[PDB]
Amino acid sequence: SMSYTWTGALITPCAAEESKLPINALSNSLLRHHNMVYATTSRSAGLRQKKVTFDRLQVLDDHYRDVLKEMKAKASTVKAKLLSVEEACKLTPPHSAKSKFGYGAKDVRNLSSKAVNHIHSVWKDLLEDTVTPIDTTIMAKNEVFCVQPEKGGRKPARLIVFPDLGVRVCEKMALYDVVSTLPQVVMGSSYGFQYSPGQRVEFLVNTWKSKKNPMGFSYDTRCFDSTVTENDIRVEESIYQCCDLAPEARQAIKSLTERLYIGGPLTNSKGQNCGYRRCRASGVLTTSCGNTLTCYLKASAACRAAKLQDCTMLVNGDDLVVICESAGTQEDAASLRVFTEAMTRYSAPPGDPPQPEYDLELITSCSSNVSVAHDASGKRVYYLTRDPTTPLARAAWETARHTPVNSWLGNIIMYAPTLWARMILMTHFFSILLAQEQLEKALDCQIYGACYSIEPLDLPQIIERLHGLSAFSLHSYSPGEINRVASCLRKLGVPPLRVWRHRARSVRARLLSQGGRAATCGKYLFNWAVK
Ligand SMILES: O=C1c2cccc3c(NCCO)ccc(c23)C(=O)N1c1cccc(Br)c1
Ligand SMILES: [Mn+2]
Ligand SMILES: [Mn+2]
Numbered sequence: 160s161m162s163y164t165w166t167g168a169l170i171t172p173c174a175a176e177e178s179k180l181p182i183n184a185l186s187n188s189l190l191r192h193h194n195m196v197y198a199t200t201s202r203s204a205g206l207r208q209k210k211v212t213f214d215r216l217q218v219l220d221d222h223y224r225d226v227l228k229e230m231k232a233k234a235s236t237v238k239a240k241l242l243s244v245e246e247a248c249k250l251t252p253p254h255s256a257k258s259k260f261g262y263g264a265k266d267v268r269n270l271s272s273k274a275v276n277h278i279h280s281v282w283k284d285l286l287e288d289t290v291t292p293i294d295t296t297i298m299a300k301n302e303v304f305c306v307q308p309e310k311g312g313r314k315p316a317r318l319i320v321f322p323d324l325g326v327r328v329c330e331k332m333a334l335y336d337v338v339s340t341l342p343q344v345v346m347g348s349s350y351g352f353q354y355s356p357g358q359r360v361e362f363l364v365n366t367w368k369s370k371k372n373p374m375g376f377s378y379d380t381r382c383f384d385s386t387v388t389e390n391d392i393r394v395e396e397s398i399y400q401c402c403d404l405a406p407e408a409r410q411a412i413k414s415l416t417e418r419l420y421i422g423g424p425l426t427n428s429k430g431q432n433c434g435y436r437r438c439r440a441s442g443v444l445t446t447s448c449g450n451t452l453t454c455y456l457k458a459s460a461a462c463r464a465a466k467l468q469d470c471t472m473l474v475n476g477d478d479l480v481v482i483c484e485s486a487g488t489q490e491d492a493a494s495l496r497v498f499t500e501a502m503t504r505y506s507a508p509p510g511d512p513p514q515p516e517y518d519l520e521l522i523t524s525c526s527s528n529v530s531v532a533h534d535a536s537g538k539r540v541y542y543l544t545r546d547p548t549t550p551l552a553r554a555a556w557e558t559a560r561h562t563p564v565n566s567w568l569g570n571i572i573m574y575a576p577t578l579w580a581r582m583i584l585m586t587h588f589f590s591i592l593l594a595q596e597q598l599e600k601a602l603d604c605q606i607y608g609a610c611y612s613i614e615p616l617d618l619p620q621i622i623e624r625l626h627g628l629s630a631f632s633l634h635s636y637s638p639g640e641i642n643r644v645a646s647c648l649r650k651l652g653v654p655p656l657r658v659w660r661h662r663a664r665s666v667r668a669r670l671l672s673q674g675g676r677a678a679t680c681g682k683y684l685f686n687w688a689v690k
Pocket of ligand 3: 379380
């Protein structure tokens with residue numbers, strides 16, 4: 160069960176890769192320790208390969224089997240349909256990698272005969288050949304981070320593995336309707352992707368408050384995708400086949416798991432053979448649903464193994480939160496050790512071992528945590544934050560560069576209630592949109608796995624719908640939260656919060672004087688700045 164087998168061949172780039180922040184005049188006003196902000200490249204690909212390559216041992220027991228039976232019973236109440244070639248094309252992402260067979264994502268979306276003809280041929284092949292492993296390409300991702308001191312520092316580039324565009328569209332034809340419906344039915348309230356930030360918070364908080372003495376922990380699996388075995392991917396297929404599906408859907412799902420999901424060969428961007436995969440591919444339709452199902456399965460079983468009492472789970476990828484009743488500090492510590500023992504048997508050991516927590520604010524998963532502030536009436540309001548280091552580092556990058564993804568705008572939307580998105584991100588970018596003549600100009604923005612064309616002036620209305628009117632009135636943030644933000648600004652050389660407020664006082668006035676919907680932005684987004 161070796162997760163990967165490699166050959167000499169290198170994981171290679173497809174174009175120029177920048178690894179370092181530039182020196183913009185605008186960038187330095189946000190952030191002045193510019194040697195801390197980097198970007199992964201193929202140069203580090205080999206370090207990542209080393210980490211993600213190991214033999215997997217997996218030993219199942221009745222806890223696993225009992226949970227899996229309960230899951231299949233739930234799956235058996237799901238019905239799902241085939242998408243037609245046309246529906247799958249229309250649901251294809253705008254900016255996904257072009258096909259080797261002469262068409263790209265925009266051709267797919269506009270139902271180009273070239274795309275449609277090819278996808279029909281790929282479908283027929285999936286139905287008629289259930290064995291030939293399907294080609295994939297492997298690439299090192301280009302993501303922006305901030306360096307860490309106390310940790311090792313510089314992370315290697317993540318690896319992505321994906322089949323051709325044509326195959327990706329067939330995946331949607333066979334499984335889009337499954338992957339969109341099945342998870343919620345099987346996992347119910349534990350299925351994290353159903354929640355907006357406020358609803359996730361509402362779930363964790365009501366869950367937390369229902370225990371007499373609450374204890375929670377997060378868990379995150381070391382190299383999760385590599386820990387996923389052929390057993391795991393076959394179990395997944397067996398859950399999908401519990402569904403009520405069309406005959407042709409069944410055939411394509413079985414075929415896709417034999418030819419693609421289970422494993423297959425890996426090829427370079429130059430066309431060379433890099434090796435063989437026997438674990439989860441990170442770039443298939445089924446990655447998110449599969450990781451979530453498999454993490455839930457193993458974690459549910461592992462909670463029974465550790466005898467955790469009145470457990471409640473929340474799962475996104477391999478990102479897991481558990482909230483249960485405390486048995487006491489030494490009891491909880493021992494239980495956690497037994498929880499990760501079971502998980503490790505099931506093949507999924509943790510990056511860092513979990514730690515029991517008695518303060519909900521201190522539980523981090525999906526890079527996020529719950530925290531408290533007060534609304535205009537002084538009432539306690541709970542909301543989702545995260546450490547602002549990465550959002551700021553990518554904000555500094557996107558100030559100095561094009562970027563067809565606007566992570567700053569995604570962060571303002573998702574984290575609109577936070578101290579840091581309000582004082583720093585909203586101020587910095589409205590200042591730049593004010594100086595350039597560009598308040599009316601729509602921007603591309605990737606959030607919750609989709610690409611939106613966002614008018615900056617729509618932000619008041621977006622934030623209100625997503626978070627509610629309170630997002631414009633929060634005050635009296637937690638000492639821990641305030642602390643973390645201030646210490647992150649010092650670490651990165653971004654100006655302290657008192658500077659951001661002055662700049663925002665001026666940003667607010669300039670928006671107000673500009674009159675219409677610009678002034679609406681000034682009122683709502685920056686009401687915090689003016690007494
Ligand atoms: O406006 C400030 C502010 C201005 C200047 C300095 C500080 C501040 N001092 C930084 C010490 O590290 C801490 C918190 C806030 C703050 C702080 O929480 N706020 C604030 C109050 C209400 C809403 C919002 Br958004 C921010
Ligand atoms: Mn992980
Ligand atoms: Mn994770």
